Each structure stands twice: as C-alpha cells, then as structure tokens.
Design a protein around this nucleic acid. Structure first.
Lengths: 399, 974, 410
DNA sequence: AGGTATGGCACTGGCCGTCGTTTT
DNA sequence: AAAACGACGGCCAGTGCCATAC
C-alpha cells in the first residue's frame, strides 16, 4: 500500500487512486507511468542494451514491425484490424445477405491484420537476410526492445514492453550456450539489487520435452515470472521456410548445418516494479541504485539576494547538464517549504544529493552537501563538486 | 518686406521688424545692374515663383543693439562660472605629492606631512581627474587620483580592497565613483585628457535629471591649437614636402608628446609591463604603490599642460560662443532598456548562423580538393596549380567453440598488453607536429590541437582569403582569375605565342574554347601588363571603382555584385553558389567590423529609488523592466575642422533591409513619459557656400547664379543645379549629381575625365578631356582675366581662396583661427585643398555651436523640462518630458531662424530668404530614426519594431502645425 | 537516375530492407515498407537522441510523457477506420443462428460503440495528462510535454496500415504570448533541421491558415522530385482542453505572473522516418565534380551510424589480435562505435576496403601493423580528405572524444 | 589637385626561445 | 654530465585594402 501511494504521489505512476491496483499493474492495463517512471525505464533499457549488445561483435539490432499483414491461421480468438467501412465494402450489393452472419466470422478470420504478440517471429523473418552480414558464420544474434499486446482475462488490452534476444547456434552446443545465457542474465538481474537473494532461477520442461529456464523475483505476496529462456530447436525455421533447405544453411565446423534457435525474453515493466519494491526496504526513503535513479541532484537557494544567487545557480545547472548529469531545479521554488519537508520530498524522489547555494557561496564559494544514503552534511567548494559527482557515479558502476 | 530686388520672397514683415532694424541700407543701383546682366547671360531672369504663406510671431526679447550682442551676452552668461573655476587652476600652488598612498576604501584627502584622512567626497570646485580600469575584470573603475588647488586625492574600489568569489556583472551606480556634492557657487569644472572616459565612471552622471557639472578636455584644446592633418600625421611620424617648417610647432595627440611640446623638461615614463591592460587583479594588489605613483605622475603632467594651453585657446578663439558650444557638446546621454540585451543576443545568433552556412560551403570545397594530390593531377588544374603541394615526413627521435571460460583473464590480458604498449610514449618528440601528411595549403587552414578554440576541419577559411576564389574557380568573361603580387586581382587571357608551368597554353585554351562553343588581341581593358610573365596568357587587371591605379583586394566586394547578376563574373560549382556567397557577404560585412565595439558598450541600470516619479507613476511603466543609459565618449574636437569624434555612435549605420545589425540606433528608447525631439539641417553646406558667394559678389541674396539656382530651382523646370549641369553636356541628372559633389570638394579634370570614361564606354580619352574642359569652363570659368572669371560659381571659389590665402585665416562668421600648423608662414602652398575645405567645415561647426547655445537659452528661459541627447555633425536631438514635446518643436524652430539670421548678419546682409527660415519638419518620436515612418525590419528583426516592442511611428510637423498646436507661445499657460 | 543508384547503395549496405519492388517512392513515403536495416535503425536512434538533446535536456520546464498506443472505452460513431474487433465478440448478433438478411446493419452500431482504436496522434494522450502534470511546476504556465513513438495511418487490395515514427512537443502558453512562442519555436526547429544539413537551403518554411483560420507553419524538404512535408506547427487555442474537461474551469487555471488564465496549446509534430530519408538524400551526390567519381555518404558526425573501422596488417597474428582486442574494449567502454574488420580474414585490398567504408559512411579507418608493436604508432585515414596520418595509440581515445564532442560546435 | 574621421581582417618580415644533434 | 649551436615555430608591429558616417 504505502509504497504504491508514495509512487502515485511522486509521479512514478500515473492515473488516480481508484485505478491504482497491483493486479492491473501486473496485467499491463494500468493507466501508465509518470515521467519518473519513464526515466527509470529508459535507464533500465540502456543498461540492458550495454550489457547484451554493445560488447558483442555478432549481436545486431532488428526492426520488427508492430503488426502482421495478410491471411492468418483460423480458429484464433485474437484481435483483428477490421473496419465498419469494410463492412460496407463487402456489401458491394445488398443481396449478399445470404448465410452471412456465420460466414462473416470465417471471413474476418480469413482476411485481416493482427497485432504483434511477440518479437520472436519478426526476428525469425529476418534470419536469411541478416545471415549475409556475418558472412554466414553461424553463431549470431538479433536483439530488439519493444511493446507487445496481450489479451487480458469483454476482454481488454495489456501492453508490455519486452527485451528480446534471439541467439542462433550449432545444435552441438545449444545447451552450453543456454547455461551461459542463464548465468549472465541472472547475474545482470542481481547486480543492481539491494537483496540479490530475492532473485531466483528454476529449471522447466516443455510439453514437447524441450529444455528451458525461468527467472523470478520474490515480491512480498509471492514469486512473479520475469524472464524465460527456451531452447526451441529448429521447427519454426523449417515451418517459416519450406522447400530447398540449402538457403537455411550456415557454416559450422567448416561444414553447412541448420542452426538451433535460442529465445531470451524479459519483461521490463516487471523489472521496474521489482526494483521499486526492492528499494523500499522512523525514516522512509527509496534507495534506488545510483545507476538507475532517474534524477541525481537537486539545486536550491537559501536566504538572501535572490537575483544574484539565481545566476550562479543557472551557471551550475548548465555546468552539470553539459557533463550529462540530470538535475532537479528546485531553486525556482524560492524554497517556500521548511527544510524538513524539502528533505522528505527529496528522499521520496530517491534524489542522491541536494545542494544549497547561499550568500556565503558568493563570499567564499562553500556549498552545503547532503547525501541521501548517509544523511550526513558537509561543506565543499563549488569548483570541485562536478568531479566529485562523476567520481561517485563511476565508483558505484565499477563495484 | 515681401520681396527684395530680383523679386525673391523675403522674411515676413513682423519677423524682419523684430529681428532687424528698419534703418538698413540700399545695395546701390550699380550692384543691381551688375547682378541683372549676370543673370541675363545665364538665362535665370524669368520667375518660377510660388509665394510661401506668411508667418508672424511674438519672439522672446532680444538683448542689446543687434543679434551678435545678443549671442555674446547669452554665451557669456552660460560660460562665466566655469571660466571662473578654471582661473583657480592657473594659480594653484600644489603641495608635495604624498610619500605613501593610502590603502583604505573610498576617498582619502592628504594633509601636508603626508597624513591620510578619510573624507566622503573631495568637496572642491575644480579638479584634475584620472581613472584606471583593470581590463580583465570588465568595465568597473579600479582606482583614481585627483588634485585640487590645495590637496592630493586618491580613490580605491571595493573590488580592489576586498576579496570575493563573485561580484554582480550587471553594473549599478553604487559601484561608480561619487563626485558631485549634495544639494559656494558650486558649478563644478572637471578637466582631463580624454576626459570623457573618466566621465563615464561617475555615478551621478547617469541620473535622468541634469547636473551642473561640465567637462573640459586637454586633447580637444590641442586639436584646436596646432592639431595636425591625418596626412601630416603620417609625415610627422616618418620624420621621427619641402617647407618642413610646421613640424617644430605641432605634434600627435598622445599625452607624452603634448607635454613635450607645451611644457618640455624630462620625458614622461610609462610602466613597461602594462598591468592594467594585460595583468590581473593579483598584480594590481601586489604592485599597488607603483601604480598609484604612475597615476599621480600623469595627473601632474595634465595639470602642467592645462596651465599653458588655456591663454592660447582664449586668444585664438576669442568669441564666447565657441567655448560655450564646446562645453555643451560634452554632456550627451543615450537612454536604453532591457531590449538592448535581447537585441545583442539576436544579432549574435543571426551572425553565427549565417557565418556557419558560409563556412560549411567553403569547407566542403576544401575537403574535396585534397583528392587532386593523387597522380599530380593538380598540375593540370588552371586553378591551384601554384599552391604548396608538398608532404612533410613524420619525424622520430634518433572451429566453433562453446562459451568462454576465465573471460576475466582475457580481459586483464588485453588491458595489460594495451598499458604496456601505451607506455612507449617516452620516445616521442616533445613538440607535437602539425598535420605533416596534409598538403601545406590545407595545413594552413586548420587550427592547432593546442588552441582552446579548435574545431574539426579547415574552419579558418574566409571569403577574403586569397585561396578562396581559386577554390570556387571564379571566372570573368570566361577567363580564370589570377592574383598578381604587384597588381592584385586580374584574369588570364589565353592565346599568346612567344610567351608574352604545365597549365600554360593548354588547359585554359581548352576551357575558353568550350565557353566560346557554348555561346594584337581580341580583348581590351586594363591592357596587357608584360610585367607579369605567365607563358601563353596575357594578364589584365580587374577594373576598380576608383580607376585603373587602384588594386582590387577581393572580388567579393559590393561593387562586383552587379557583374555577378549580369553574368560577367561566374563560379564553377554552379549558378546558385556565387550570388548567394555575395549576398551573405553583403548581409554580414557591417556586423563583422563593429560587433566588439557594440557589444562592449558600458551600461548602468538605475534602481527603483533613483527613477523620477513621472516614470514610476505612469500607465506605461512596467515592473521587471530595466532602465539605464550609455554615455558616449565624444572628444569635443577631434579633427582639424574641430568636429566631434566618437568610436561607435558617429559611424553607426542607419536601419537597412538585408543588413544584419542596422537597427542599432532604434534601440535608444525614451522611458515612459519622455520623448525624443530633433531635426536635421537642410542642405547646410551648399547654402553656406552659396551665401558666401553672394556676400562676396554684390551683397544681395541670389546675386550670383549659383545662389539663385540654390534658392529657386524647383526640379520641375529644367533649372536646378543638376538639370543645368546635365544640360551643358549630355549626361543624366544622376551622373551630374556625382560630378557636382565631386567638383565642390575640389576635383579637377583627372577626376571628371575618369568618371566620363567610366560612364560612357564609347568615349575616346580626347573626347573626355575636351568635354571636361568645357564643363569646367561652364561651371567655374577661366583662371584669370588676361591673355576665376566667367563661371556660375567663380565668386564663391574666389572668396574661399581669399580666406585661405590670408596671413591668419579666420572663420568668416565667428573668427576662430585655423591651426598654426597650416598658416601660410609654416606651409607655403602645401595642403591647399584641406585649407580650402576647412573654411566651410569650420563654418558648419560654428553653426552647430550657435544652435546649442540658443537651445540652452530657451530651455532655461521658459523652464522647459528637457535635456540635450546627442548630435551628429548636422543633427541635434533632445530628450523631453512628453508634456513639453510641442513647445520643444517651437523652440527648435526659433533656434533655426535665429541661427540662419545670425549667419547672414556677420556677412553684411540685412535680410533672409523666406524659404530657408525654418526646418522642413521637426520629428517627435520614441526612438531614433532617419525617418518617422520606418518600421526597421532587418534579418535580425524581421517582424519589425512595432511587433517585437510595440513602439509606434511618430509625427513630422512643419511650422504651421506647431503654431496650431501651440498658438505661437512658449509659455506654460499656452 | 541518381535516386536509383542511391537506393542500390542503401540496400546493399543494409540501410533499407526488402526487394526493389517494396522500395518504390510511394511505399517509402507512405510508411508501409518492410522496415529498416540495422544501419538505418542506428541512424534513426542517433537522430532521435539529437532531437531529445535539443528539445528536452536543456529545457528546464519540459518533461517526458508516455501516451499508450490504443484508445480504450466507448468511441464516437462514424469514424471510418479499422478497430480492434474480434470473431469471438461477433456472436452478439448470433444469439439465434438462423437470423440473416439485409437487416444486419444494426450490428454496425455495436462494433462502433464498444471496440478500441489504434492511436493516430500523440497530442490527445498528452492532453489527458495536463491536469496531473501541472502539479510538477506549481502551475507556472509555460511548461511542456514531449514524447517519441509510432503512429498508425490508414492508406490506400483494399487497405493497408502505415506505421510512422513521430516526435511531438505540446507547449502550454498564456494567451498573449502565443504568437511570440510560435515564432520562437519556428526559428528554433528550423535551425535545428538546418544544423545537420549539408545544403540547409533545401530546408524551408511557409505560413499557413487552417480551414478554421488559425495560424501555423509547415516545414518542407526539397527532394529531387519536389517538396515534401516534414513538420507542422499549430496554435490550437483552448477549445480542445475545454472539450476534454467540461464543467468547473477552476481545475484548468494556471498561474501567469500574478494572474490566473487558461493557456493556449501550441502543438509541434515532426516525422522522423522522412527525416532519415531526407538526410540520406542530402548526404549523397566542372572537373572537380566531373572527375571525382568517388561514392560516399557525407553524414554528419553526430548522426553517422558507424564511426571507426579496425583492421590489421600482416604479421604475428596473436600479437595484433590481442592489441586490437585492447583497442576495441577501450573504445567501446567510452561510447565510440567500432566495426571489427580485423575479424574477416582480409580478402580485400585496401582500395576495396576504403570503397566499402566510404559507402558505409564510416568516419575513420584505423590500421595496426608490425611497426606498432615497436613504436606504438597507428595509421589513420580520414573519410573527408582520404589523407593518411600517423598517431600514437596513447592519445586515440581522447582525440576521437574531442572530435565528436566538438562536432556539435562546428 | 574629391573633404574629414573611425575601425576591421589578411598578410609579411624580424626577432627571441627551446628542444634536439654535434660536442668538451 | 655540463655546455655549444643550429633549425624551426610563436609573437608582434607595420602595410594594404574594404567598410561605416556626414
């Protein structure tokens, strides 16, 4: 309760107190996130992109579209892109009103578009073209982050943003690569945690018999699924490309073989909620990890000649932004609050540091610094604060 | 009388009665017939007259017998307290300079025995004053020294004595020097050298109401006595044609040479290290005593110079009008608001974007040209074949596995390999070499990595660099451009055997053959100089606006833009690029030259408690606005003609479309409840020359043909000056305008024969010489009457040469002497055209002084609430509280009339033509403009003044509208 | 002509995707092509990050927003387009299977009333957040909301979906300032577009009036066949906000100076896929032209997708490979994108590699040799000049960081 | 015998400094 | 290992030309 109430008050979530419910957030049909949630998600996504893609010479981004055209496979209860305009188009004449009420069901099941359910199929549609980029060397990957659409339960739409990697491999080594990716993904989820024992893994088996793994986070009410790994084999590539298999071959061991497909997919909105709960563990504060927290530092102004203090705050604000530090410009508010409320507000926003500029800054350049973690206060000279902050961020990242 | 002889309309009955006496005199019958037969031989004796509506006024009471007595009494009353204060400085007995300079903040007065005492203000009637400024810190005054008749004084800035992390960069009067006293005769005089810079640092000088204080400048009195011509300046410096006697009595304007001439003794010493212009505040704190010593030294030398100069000035310009004029010229005042900052930002941004657009286009050409190095292909390009195409050597000192295991080991392995190889830096030379593998020409275009202003690419390139037109492959009439070291820019015409280094006779021949396919010698104009010795080609100069002997310094100059649109000058990269580059150059040329001066103007912002109540209690007042002023640093006499000089405002361009900066002046904006009123003298210098010619010939207005034409040519008949010139020989009226203005400054047959050739290409040189001969016979006549006479203008030139040949030339109206450095004793017949032009220019300066004296009188007499704003040689402006704005226009018109009548009186003419008596209009406006209706759209403010700032247009009123607004009275009762 | 040679390059270097038949002008302009190849995806990501930098990062009072892709709930009847209907929900006219005949048209009301729609613009969902986000700035009326995302457009054997990536600012202004802010943002965005352009004269604006007579501006790029629209600005006033929120206007008031007013909405919306295509056409294409046949894409350093190529000379393979791995890890740890050319066995000559990298628009080729193991010097070729220089390996990182960081200030 | 002033940039030659090569 | 010198790049003053004003 309290955590979500605070997250609504401080613009992590969006909507209203009636719409705020955990089951809706899990289902992906809540009203949406606030700006702080957007920034937090962008941080998660960039740390995922750097961890998975950047340092790999053979993982490439892929551009799957949001919908599938053409004729579907019938008998699926799922969304259709169909229009009442086309209901007047089909009636090119009035007299087509024959058996039409059942028949039109089979027609809309035959000729309509579909929303994207997963990123896998869009990646598989590019395999033959992207094989040229690696000079057909068989092990390579495609990665994408994007929203997918899921039927809920008068059904409604769940929206989920998902991070996906598809890894192609010789079948000889598939289970080794599976164990490797399980190791990396689990340790990636553990790095930023304040209690990494709350992240867990399990073995599981497909109804076929194929081997897979599942990753969980222990929310206060129970474990929830966050990410899944499956060794899918080769069925889908053959089904998507009947006929002359020799276009499917790449090179392993100086010989042609059909690759095996590994699928890795994680839900980032789940991850966001997991870290929000993890950070919250008499004071209250959200101790988000320094790499993830959306706004690093707040600037304020003390008592004195406002027009002089504001121009130096402006200079400091621009100095911090030029070096890539995100800043909350509290100095616009004229510090109408008492300092107790100002600290409580910043502790709930998970701000790392707060800087007060005062007459004495104009005298000698000393600013007050507070740290969110320690609640300790010290003086520092304005000249050096930027390099202190860069140091603190690097010494967080390298541990 | 309604008319005089020759039936020209003259000053109104009541006006002439009020201004002149009824006594008068008759010209004489012989003078009349001498005038009429002269007008007969020229064809002027037929009347286009259109009689102007008569006008009547109850003028303010004059003083004494005649208008000269009146103006003397006026100028004596204005000046007397300051000449009184000035006489106290001629007899001061200065104590010894104090042995140790005091450290404290503010003002300290020193007793004998050197005892420093703190005093809030110097409390003195007369002072010599000097201010020092640390240039690194900005514009705040740093320290100063003053001397009175009885004590030494010194001042310290709080920014020097204290230490702080920051000070406000916006200036306040609280950070300027206090000088004038709280509410003795107490009409303070301040004297200095370049005193206007010291004036700029005085806090009370920025208040919107006036002040008693006035300023006198040693440099301007030097310029009056023995100031040198600009050419004489370079001669005098080279000496450190054949008379050379003037050099011993003259000098340049610097304080050292002025002390040397007027005082002598041991030379003055500068500080060698120049801490105020190049040091930093730490150095000022450390070198303190030595700097304050050098300041007292310059102060003492200024005091010594002043005592010598004043009796000579009082001798050579005795009429009090001159001194009163100079003393009023020293108090200009320009109001500004917060829009100034926005104007500066918008101008800088627009200049930057246009310059970036130009640079990108040149940089792409520079980048692509590097590809000609391969295969020595550049030897065949008819441009660039002669650049530095050299390279400089670099200088030394003498499968299918699984996932990995122990990835952290391969990580540390590679990192340590990299650190190991990184450590070999010990073998590099200490000075980093600069782009040795790029070509030398390209090498020059790129900054060094050490420069804090480095950017990638050849980003130093400009249109005005000699490489640029080779890149654009500029072509003239089909011929490639070439640069000659002697002769500047020209072009190469191919085709010449007998040679009259791989390009010759080959590539250029092909290129021109191609041009001729697309449409002795075969070409003419600035004909072939065999001094330049390119094989195969001939070299021709580009034509210059000033004729063949000037050198063209860049094809991108304005004067070539017509030939681009005509298609005579063309670029290679295609028909869009050439004219667009020329467009941009025209758009930015003014801002390039002036942006440092304009952006570093010193501005002071007035707080709430300082403003008038008529501002704060006004409907148009705003909170969170800014109000302030700029004080121009005018030198009251900067020229041999005694004109004003100022680095910025006297050369500010008028608002123009397609010129980025032009709205500079429109940013001078009256505060709520105040207004700008002023006017511009109509055709001043032509009138002055005409009336001088009339006074010399026969003592009647319009007795000479040039005088009549100046008064009676109405453009519709063929009878103005320019129509007549265009009638004597077949040229357009617009060309005759040029010939006339040239001739007035003393041009002769070389000037006119050149312009003739330059305006009709069919003319032979002999025809031009003969037509110039005839034009000059018609205009000024023949040089003597035996074996000037017989021209429309002869008597004016006779009079001017008469004045200029006198043993002591004096200005005809007010009697100021010319400079000793130009009297015929020191200079036999050198500098003659300067001496002739001086008569008119100095007369116009006397006219300016008379107008200033009259406006100060009428404002103090009718308690008008207004202030002098600025002047620009022939314009004046006044800041006025809006309630008096219509009275101010009447005072201006009366000043114009009294000035015009005064001028004629000293020439011995007792009347004035009715047409010149008043300003064609007076301008009432909220900002400064050349015309009242101009909206001043520019590329930097394309929406114009009325939408960005809401300043409306104003009114332009003739005398009659001022009457119907005022009933003809200046009384506050109306 | 030139246009097809450009499209040949763009597919062969994987900026685009799919066959010639899928890449005709109409398909690209409509947004129903198969998608972009990986280099195009990186180019678009760079362009979007430059946009985010210029619009949001430095702008003290703009904030991010996240409008959903679909509209839930009940909807107005008579809008023509596709809706999220299903064959499962179709049974609400099939309660009796023997119903039939042209009476069916009743079911149009059912499908109109209770089926969702895919979003067509970003403004509407931003307006849904106005009341909530006005708290962020203590009602101080100049504030903005920005986001980037895909939009869906109906185009025309019957129908197809266009997908377009768009970037939107919604800016709230006190009514008297509205034309001032319009002119401000018009200049700002037009200079932003011109900043990266090689021929910024090909970008232009014109004034427009909507069918109701509200003022606005349109920005065009001059493709070789004609102008195409790339961005639009409108002053919309207050009506849409009033319609969104009927009743007590006291909820809507913000603070202007000391007085309370309802703002004018300013709407700014630009097309990023057309932006990408415009810069692709910009970057490509008198003896200095007649004989420099070189094919190259002069993409701006902030935009160009791949910055450095790494290659090896012949020599001891293990030593060169380990030093290249060190270089590669160092460069990537500082955010410089690198092509591992040292991993493809070197079939080509240097001329072929240079041609390939110039088609890929790569900024710099770095070459490692035997002599580097001794003196630590590496060769560097400039794309812009084709000249070769020597540089010591200890400085390369800082040189590249300088070059890119200063490219903003060229 | 075209007048009086202001000021900018591009370019050239002369000079002192210091770092690397030939030396007590 | 202190000391001698030579070549080269950096700094400034001076000359030339173009741009503003009346």
């Amino acid at each position: 309760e309290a955590l979500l109430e605070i997250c609504q008050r401080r613009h992590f979530l969006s909507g209203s107190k009636q719409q705020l419910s955990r089951d809706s957030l899990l289902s992906g049909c809540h009203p949406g996130f606030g700006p702080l949630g957007v920034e937090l998600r962008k941080n998660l996504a960039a740390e995922w992109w750097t961890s998975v893609v950047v340092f790999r010479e053979q993982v490439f981004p892929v551009d799957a579209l949001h919908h599938k055209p053409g004729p579907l496979l019938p008998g699926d209860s799922a969304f259709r892109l169909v229009s009442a305009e086309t209901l007047r188009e089909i009636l090119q004449d009035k007299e087509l009103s024959k058996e039409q009420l059942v028949a039109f069901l089979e027609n809309v099941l035959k000729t309509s578009g579909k929303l994207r359910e997963n990123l896998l199929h869009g990646a598989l549609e590019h395999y033959v073209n992207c094989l040229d980029l690696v000079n057909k060397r068989l092990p390579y990957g495609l990665a994408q982050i994007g929203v997918c659409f899921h039927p809920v339960f008068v059904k409604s739409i769940g929206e989920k943003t998902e991070a996906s990697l598809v890894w192609f491999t010789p079948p000889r080594t598939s289970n080794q690569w599976l164990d490797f990716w399980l190791r990396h993904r689990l340790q990636w989820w553990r790095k930023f945690a304040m209690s990494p024992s709350n992240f867990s893994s399990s073995d599981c088996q497909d109804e076929e018999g194929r081997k897979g793994n599942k990753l969980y986070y222990n929310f206060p009410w129970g474990k929830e699924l966050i990410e899944t790994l499956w060794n899918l084999g080769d069925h889908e590539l053959l089904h998507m490309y009947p006929g002359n298999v020799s276009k499917l071959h790449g090179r392993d061991g100086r010989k042609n073989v059909v690759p095996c497909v590994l699928s890795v997919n994680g839900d980032l909105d789940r991850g966001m909620l997991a870290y929000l709960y993890d950070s919250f563990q008499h004071r209250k504060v959200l101790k988000l990890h320094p790499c993830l927290a959306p706004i690093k530092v707040a600037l304020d102004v003390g008592r004195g000649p406002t027009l002089e203090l504001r121009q130096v705050c402006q200079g400091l604000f621009n100095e911090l932004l030029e070096n890539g530090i995100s800043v909350w410009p509290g100095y616009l508010e004229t510090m109408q609050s008492s300092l107790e409320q100002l600290y409580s507000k910043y502790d709930e926003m998970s701000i790392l540091f707060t800087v007060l500029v005062t007459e004495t800054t104009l005298e000698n350049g000393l600013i007050h610094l507070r740290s969110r973690d320690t609640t300790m206060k010290e003086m520092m000279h304005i000249s050096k604060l930027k390099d202190f902050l860069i140091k603190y961020i690097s010494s967080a990242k390298n541990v | 009388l309604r008319h005089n002889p020759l039936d020209i309309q003259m000053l109104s009955r009541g006006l002439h009665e009020q201004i002149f006496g009824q006594g008068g005199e008759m010209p004489g019958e012989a003078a009349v017939r001498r005038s009429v037969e002269h007008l007969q031989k020229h064809g002027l004796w037929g009347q286009p007259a259109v009689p102007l509506p008569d006008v009547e006024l109850r003028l303010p009471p004059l003083y004494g017998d005649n208008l000269d007595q009146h103006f003397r009494l006026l100028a004596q009353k204005q000046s007397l307290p300051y000449l009184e204060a000035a006489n106290l400085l001629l007899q001061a007995q200065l104590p010894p300079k104090p042995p140790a300079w005091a450290w404290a903040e503010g003002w300290t007065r020193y007793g004998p025995e050197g005892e420093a005492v703190p005093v809030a203000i110097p409390e003195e009637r007369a002072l010599v004053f000097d201010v020092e400024v640390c240039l690194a810190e900005g514009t705040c005054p740093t320290l100063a020294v003053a001397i009175s008749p009885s004590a030494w004084y010194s001042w310290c800035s709080q920014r020097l004595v204290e230490e702080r992390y920051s000070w406000t960069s916006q200036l306040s009067p609280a950070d300027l020097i206090p000088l004038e006293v709280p509410t003795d005769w107490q009409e303070q005089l301040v004297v200095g050298h370049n005193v206007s810079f010291d004036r700029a640092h005085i806090r009370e000088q920025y208040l919107i109401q006036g002040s008693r204080m006035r300023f006198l400048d040693t440099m301007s009195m030097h310029m009056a006595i023995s100031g040198l011509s600009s050419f004489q300046r370079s001669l005098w410096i080279a000496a450190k044609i054949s008379s050379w006697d003037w050099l011993d009595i003259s000098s340049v304007n610097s304080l050292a040479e002025v002390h040397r001439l007027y005082v002598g003794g041991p030379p003055l010493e500068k500080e060698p290290r120049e801490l105020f212009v190049k040091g930093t505040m730490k150095d000022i704190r450390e070198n303190f005593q030595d700097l304050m010593q050098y300041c007292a030294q310059d102060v003492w030398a200024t005091h010594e110079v002043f005592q010598q100069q004043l009796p000579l000035f009082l001798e050579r310009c005795p009429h009090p009008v001159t001194l009163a004029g100079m003393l009023e010229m020293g108090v200009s005042y320009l109001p500004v608001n917060q829009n100034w900052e926005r104007y500066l930002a918008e101008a800088q941004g627009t200049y930057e974007e246009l310059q970036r657009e130009m640079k990108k286009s040149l940089m792409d050409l520079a980048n692509d040209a590097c590809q000609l190095l391969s295969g020595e292909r550049y030897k065949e390009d008819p441009w660039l074949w002669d650049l530095e195409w050299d390279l400089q050597e670099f200088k030394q000192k003498k499968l299918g596995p699984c996932s990995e295991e122990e990835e952290f080991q391969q990580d540390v392995m590679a990192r340590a390999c990299l650190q190991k190889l990184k450590g070999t830096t010990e073998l590099l030379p200490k000075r980093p070499q600069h782009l040795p593998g790029h070509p030398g020409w390209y090498r020059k275009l790129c900054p060094r990595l050490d420069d804090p202003a480095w950017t990638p690419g050849p980003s130093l390139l400009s249109l005005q660099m000699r490489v640029t037109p080779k890149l654009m492959a500029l072509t003239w009439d089909g011929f490639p451009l070439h640069y000659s070291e002697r002769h500047g820019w020209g072009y190469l015409v191919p085709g010449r055997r007998d040679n009259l280094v791989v390009c010759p006779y080959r590539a250029i021949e092909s290129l021109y053959r191609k041009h001729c396919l697309e449409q002795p010698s075969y070409h003419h104009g600035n004909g072939p100089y065999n001094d330049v010795d390119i094989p195969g080609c001939w070299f021709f100069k580009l034509p210059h606006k000033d004729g063949n002997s000037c050198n063209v310094g860049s094809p991108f100059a304005k004067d070539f833009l017509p030939k681009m649109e005509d298609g005579t000058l063309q670029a290679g990269p295609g028909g869009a690029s050439g004219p667009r580059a020329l467009e941009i150059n025209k758009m930015i040329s003014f801002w390039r030259n002036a942006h440092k001066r304009i952006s570093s103007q010193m501005v002071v912002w007035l707080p709430r408690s300082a403003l008038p109540r008529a501002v704060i209690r006004h409907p148009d007042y705003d909170e969170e606005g800014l109000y302030g002023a700029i004080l121009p640093q005018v030198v009251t006499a900067g020229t041999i003609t005694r004109r004003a000089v100022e680095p910025t405002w006297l050369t500010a361009s008028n608002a123009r479309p397609d010129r980025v900066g032009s709205e500079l002046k429109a940013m001078v904006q009256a505060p709520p409840g105040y207004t700008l009123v002023g006017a511009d003298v109509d055709s001043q210098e032509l009138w002055i020359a005409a009336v001088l010619g009339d006074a010399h010939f026969a003592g009647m207005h319009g007795c000479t043909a040039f005088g009549w034409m100046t008064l009676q040519g109405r453009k519709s008949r063929g009878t103005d000056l320019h129509s007549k010139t265009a009638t004597t020989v077949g040229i357009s009226r617009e060309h005759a305008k040029i010939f006339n203005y040239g001739r007035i400054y003393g041009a002769g047959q070389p000037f006119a024969e050149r312009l003739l050739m330059q305006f009709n290409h069919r003319l032979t040189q002999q025809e031009a010489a003969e037509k110039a001969q005839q034009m000059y016979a018609a205009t000024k006549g023949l040089r003597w009457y035996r074996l000037w006479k017989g021209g429309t203008e002869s008597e004016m030139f006779n009079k001017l040469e008469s004045i200029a040949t006198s043993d002591i030339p004096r200005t005809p109206v007010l009697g100021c002497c010319i400079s000793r450095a130009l009297e015929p004793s020191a200079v036999q017949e050198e500098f003659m055209t300067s001496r002739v032009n001086w008569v008119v220019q100095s007369s116009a300066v006397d006219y300016l002084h008379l107008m200033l004296v009259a406006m100060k009188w009428l404002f103090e007499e009718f308690a008008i609430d207004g202030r002098f704003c600025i002047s620009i040689h022939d314009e004046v402006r006044y800041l006025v509280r809006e309630e008096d704005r219509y009275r101010a226009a009447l005072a201006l018109q009366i000043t114009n009339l009294l000035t015009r009548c005064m001028f004629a009186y000293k020439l011995g003419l007792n009347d004035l033509p009715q047409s010149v008596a008043f300003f064609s209009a007076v301008d009432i406006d909220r900002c400064l403009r050349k015309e009242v209706t101009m909206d001043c759209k520019t590329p930097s403010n394309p929406t114009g003044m009325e939408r960005r700032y809401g300043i409306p247009q104003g009114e332009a009123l003739d005398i009659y509208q001022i009457i119907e607004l005022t009933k003809g009275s200046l009384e506050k009762r109306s």
